[PDB]
Amino acid sequence: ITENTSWNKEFSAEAVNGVFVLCKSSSKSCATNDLARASKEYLPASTFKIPNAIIGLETGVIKNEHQVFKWDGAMKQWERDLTLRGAIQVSAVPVFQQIAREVGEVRMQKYLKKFSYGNQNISGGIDKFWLEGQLRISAVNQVEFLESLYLNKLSASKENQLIVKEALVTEAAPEYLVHSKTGFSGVGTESNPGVAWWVGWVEKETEVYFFAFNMDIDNESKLPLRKSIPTKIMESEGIIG
Amino acid sequence: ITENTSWNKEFSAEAVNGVFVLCKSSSKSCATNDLARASKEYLPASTFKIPNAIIGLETGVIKNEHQVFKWDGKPRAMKQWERDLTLRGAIQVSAVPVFQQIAREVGEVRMQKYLKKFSYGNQNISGGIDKFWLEGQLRISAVNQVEFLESLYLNKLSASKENQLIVKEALVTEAAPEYLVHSKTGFSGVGTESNPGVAWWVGWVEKETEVYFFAFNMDIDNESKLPLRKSIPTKIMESEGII
């Protein structure tokens, strides 16, 4: 992994502290704006839905690709029936809290170990460790995890990895496909900021690029930078056009 | 299946002779504009890439989802095909030479077997192994495409579930958090004024927790009308609230 400090310009103009990690073909060929931050570990927030969904399927907590998460009857979002894809792609706190409780802590721990997922610390509450608990993961580790999923190399069936991968598709054109996932822990303060993420991969013609971005957030209006900074960096590398 | 005569309005403007079949939830609930036409059988043209890809994977001719189909540098009919392509790419830019080569490696005995299992059309692959779907005798109806695509959606085709899922991702054409379209076009050519060609668009839409299966075909003798194969069906779906 090499450092490209010229990438800092994209963060500085907005006064944001963050990191971007980008790898072409494999995790053997990565660059970042900040080597130190690239390996610092942050709460995953909703990026945890990726491993949670896979564990859910492997264990049977989630039955199959076509399962519907029906509303039982504070957020409008949480009052609608959702597909797995819908649950991943829109806000659905109650769905994932229930999946995590059903998996349980022993099984959750085994899978995080198999996946080499961050610090693998799930204390803080079975239904909130990824959001207000002790779990932490680096941008580097995100890229490594996502590459394994891309290749179907996680300790999970190929079918379940494929199911999760379809649910992560967010942009589609004939020769350009994007799988990605945001995460956001909440707006913190200047001295105790939250963290926001954007992770995924881009398949462009026959190349693949893995990416992971994170940033400290203390101002609600800065949230969209989680997509625009990586996009600008990717653009300057020639990926987007 | 019932007939929705009001849908004809979308064909009258452009004088198109064709048919749209739309099914909500499953193929046990279908509507179409032309009952006669819905079961009539036509050359599938590039819509055949869907079973061809599944069969390619099942036979091991296509190695896995990440297989790259390398360009040898020699002229192809379309500039868009003159490059290395992934499986998704090859399908989406409808790279005929890539799939002709797949067919040849699959071969007639295996192809016949899989189409029988898939209940694909008239299952007639005479006309040469690398052209039966383009200029040969293979024929499938809009209602048959819908049956086949539902099986694929449900993973009920006689192929591994992994392979059905691979082809499924390769067919994604429109994505949003609660909206996903999987689709494939086809076009046989312009034929003559008297024996015109056929144009297709087939697929399914997942909107919130519902699924809609659809197929459309139309007669065509002028290439400039090609886009109506998407625009007509799209107009009917949007008028039904599928957007």
CB atoms within 10 A of CB B72: 7
Residues 6+ apart with CB under 8 A from A64: A57, A163
Helix (H, G, I), strand (E, B) or coil at A192: coil
Tokens of B129: 């192994």
Tokens of A166: 């379809």
Question: Is residue A142 left, alpha or beta, with left meaning phi > 0 and alpha meaning psi from -120 to 50?
Answer: alpha
Which member of A46, A138, A180, A185 is catalytic? A46
Instruction: List helix spans (H) across chain A.
Output: 9-12, 35-38, 49-59, 84-89, 93-103, 105-114, 129-132, 139-150, 158-168, 225-236
CA distance A78 to A194: 22
Element (H, E) at B57: helix B49-58
CA A58, A63, A66, A69 torsion-angle sign: negative
* DSSP-assigned states of every residue in B29-46: SEEES-HHHHT-EE--GG
* DSSP-assigned states of every residue in A10-60: HHHTTT--EEEEEEESSTTSEEES-HHHHT--B--GGGGHHHHHHHHHHHT
Identify the domain containing residue B182 by its residue range: 1-243
Q: Which residue has the tokens 């599928």?
A: B242
Tokens of B98: 């890539």
CA distance A219 to B111: 60
Number of domains observed in the structure of chain B:
1
Q: Is A219 buried (19+), middle (13-18) or exposed (0-12) by CB count in 10 A? A: middle
Give the residue from A43, A19, A41 showing the smallest Cα distance to A30.
A19
CA distance B207 to B183: 14
CA distance A142 to A200: 9
Q: How was this structure determined?
A: X-ray
Contacts of A167 in chain B (CB under 8 A): none
Instruction: For chain B, list residues whose CB is within 8 angstroms of any CB belonging to chain A.
Output: 65-66, 68, 83-86, 88-89, 92-93, 154, 161-162, 165-166, 168-169, 172-175, 177-178, 180, 206, 208-209
CA distance B160 to A206: 25
CA distance B22 to A63: 28
CA A234, A219, A198, A40 torsion-angle sign: positive
CA B150 vs CA A167, B12, B27, B137, B213: distances in Å: 19, 29, 7, 24, 7
A228: domain CATH number is 3.40.710.10
Q: How far apart are the first and last CA of chain A?
A: 25
CB A143 within 8 A of CB A102: no
CB atoms within 10 A of CB A23: 23
Helix (H, G, I), strand (E, B) or coil at B86: coil
Q: What is the resolution of this structure in A?
A: 1.9
Q: Give the CA count within 13 Å in the CB-facing half-sphere of B14.
A: 18
Tokens of B20: 């749209």
Say yes or no for a CB contact (<8 Å) between B86 and A206.
Answer: yes
